[PDB]
Amino acid sequence: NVAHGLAWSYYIGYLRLILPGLQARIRMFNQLHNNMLSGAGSRRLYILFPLDCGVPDNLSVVDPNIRFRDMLPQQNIDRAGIKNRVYSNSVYEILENGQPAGVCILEYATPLQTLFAMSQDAKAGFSREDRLEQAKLFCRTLEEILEDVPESRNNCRLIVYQEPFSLSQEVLRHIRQE
Amino acid sequence: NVAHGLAWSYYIGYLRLILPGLQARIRMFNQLHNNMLSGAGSRRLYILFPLDCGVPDNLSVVDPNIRFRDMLPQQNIDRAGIKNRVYSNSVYEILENGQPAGVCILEYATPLQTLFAMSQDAKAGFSREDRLEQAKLFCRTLEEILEDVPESRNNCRLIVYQEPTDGNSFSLSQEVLRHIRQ
Ligand SMILES: Nc1ncnc2c1ncn2[C@@H]1O[C@@H]2COP(=O)(O)O[C@H]3[C@@H](O)[C@H](n4cnc5c(N)ncnc54)O[C@@H]3COP(=O)(O)O[C@H]2[C@H]1O
Numbered sequence: 001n002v003a004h005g006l007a008w009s010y011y012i013g014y015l016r017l018i019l020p021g022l023q024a025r026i027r028m029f030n031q032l033h034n035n036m037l038s039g040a041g042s043r044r045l046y047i048l049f050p051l052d053c054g055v056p057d058n059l060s061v062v063d064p065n066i067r068f069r070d071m072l073p074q075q076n077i078d079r080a081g082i083k084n085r086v087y088s089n090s091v092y093e094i095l096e097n098g099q100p101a102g103v104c105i106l107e108y109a110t111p112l113q114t115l116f117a118m119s120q121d122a123k124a125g126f127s128r129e130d131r132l133e134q135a136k137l138f139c140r141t142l143e144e145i146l147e148d149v150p151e152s153r154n155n156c157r158l159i160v161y162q163e164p165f166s167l168s169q170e171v172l173r174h175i176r177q178e
Numbered sequence: 179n180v181a182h183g184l185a186w187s188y189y190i191g192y193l194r195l196i197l198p199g200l201q202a203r204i205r206m207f208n209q210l211h212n213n214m215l216s217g218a219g220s221r222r223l224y225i226l227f228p229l230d231c232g233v234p235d236n237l238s239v240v241d242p243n244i245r246f247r248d249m250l251p252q253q254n255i256d257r258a259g260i261k262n263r264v265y266s267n268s269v270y271e272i273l274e275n276g277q278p279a280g281v282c283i284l285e286y287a288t289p290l291q292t293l294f295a296m297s298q299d300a301k302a303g304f305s306r307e308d309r310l311e312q313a314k315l316f317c318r319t320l321e322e323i324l325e326d327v328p329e330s331r332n333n334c335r336l337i338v339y340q341e342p343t344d345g346n347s348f349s350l351s352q353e354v355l356r357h358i359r360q
Contacts (some may be wrong), residue, residue, distance in 0.1 A: 008302065009184065013292055048259065080235060080291060081286045083249060107260050116184070
């Protein structure tokens with residue numbers, strides 16, 4: 001199942017690596033940028049999961065209420081022969097009525113671009129309904145791996161959504177949760 | 179289709195991205211390192227494909243004759259929200275009883291690590307015969323995807339091999355040299 005591969009790829013090749021040392025890179029960010037990620041809703045990685053598989057590379061474009069602030073300190077790992085493979089995250093202010101109402105670390109789940117792609121292939125196949133079906137399983141499979149590792153919930157939130165819808169707002173919702 | 183998602187991932191999420199900008203970075207690497215990557219066989223990205231899916235992080239350990247030299251310039255891309263996501267590649271000397279035999283860009287196919295642990299997982303399951311079958315399919319799917327990308331053959335070389343369990347001899351560093359020597 002493609003989705004299980006995508007989900008295991010995301011965990012193994014990324015989360016499992018990135019998640020143990022997030023709070024470390026955040027204590028550093030606060031010392032460096034004047035205690036910006038102070039709040040509890042600020043000390044997690046918010047991962048956007050459009051079930052439509054539509055994933056823009058620039059967030060400010062898509063919702064002008066999401067403004068780039070800085071990047072977390074870089075994290076450098078030897079990976080499968082690549083020396084110092086770089087793992088980098090970005091920090092964002094979210095706006096409400098043009099005011100900075102909250103800050104967080106934010107990105108999309110990259111492999112949904114891959115799912116989209118497979119789906120448009122003239123021989124691979126899928127349809128919108130098959131692709132949406134695989135997107136949900138991707139998400140479901142990712143959740144259930146994350147359970148066996150309670151370093152997840154402290155460190156990361158999944159934000160899942162389908163568009164049959166305010167992005168900067170739904171992000172504030174979760175930030176304000178904590 | 180697990181291997182299929184993985185073959186599409188390595189391309190859509192990597193080779194699509196970095197193969198085009200590869201030669202610009204090499205020529206820069208040459209100007210900062212005394213024209214090291216001189217040969218046509220050196221100006222390629224060599225990707226190791228162990229069908230055994232045992233993919234260690236450090237090469238020199240797995241074959242003493244593969245020595246880390248330096249790194250290519252990094253390429254930064256805004257990607258799915260991450261600003262300046264970094265794409266980095268490493269350069270290697272390949273030794274032959276202490277004599278520098280060839281020099282290239284070299285790495286493993288990272289997703290092989292994913293099949294490995296997937297197989298080991300208690301519930302995700304599948305055996306060593308099933309993982310081997312999926313690793314093969316990965317390569318095959320990858321290679322057919324790449325047909326529509328004529329730049330690729332001038333930029334990267336897939337090096338597929340299974341390691342011996344029968345006692346036979348296999349030299350990885352030799353294998354890389356053969357490919358370079360093409
Ligand atoms: N440094 C990072 N920063 C932020 N997110 C990250 C990340 N590394 C990984 N991810 C997430 O991990 C997914 C799979 O990572 P993976 O490393 O196993 O497997 C990767 C890897 O095999 C190859 N690859 C991708 N990016 C690479 C890179 N920057 N350097 C070397 N190889 C890379 O592409 C495969 C799939 O790439 P893909 O990007 O689509 O998808 C990545 C991405 O979704």
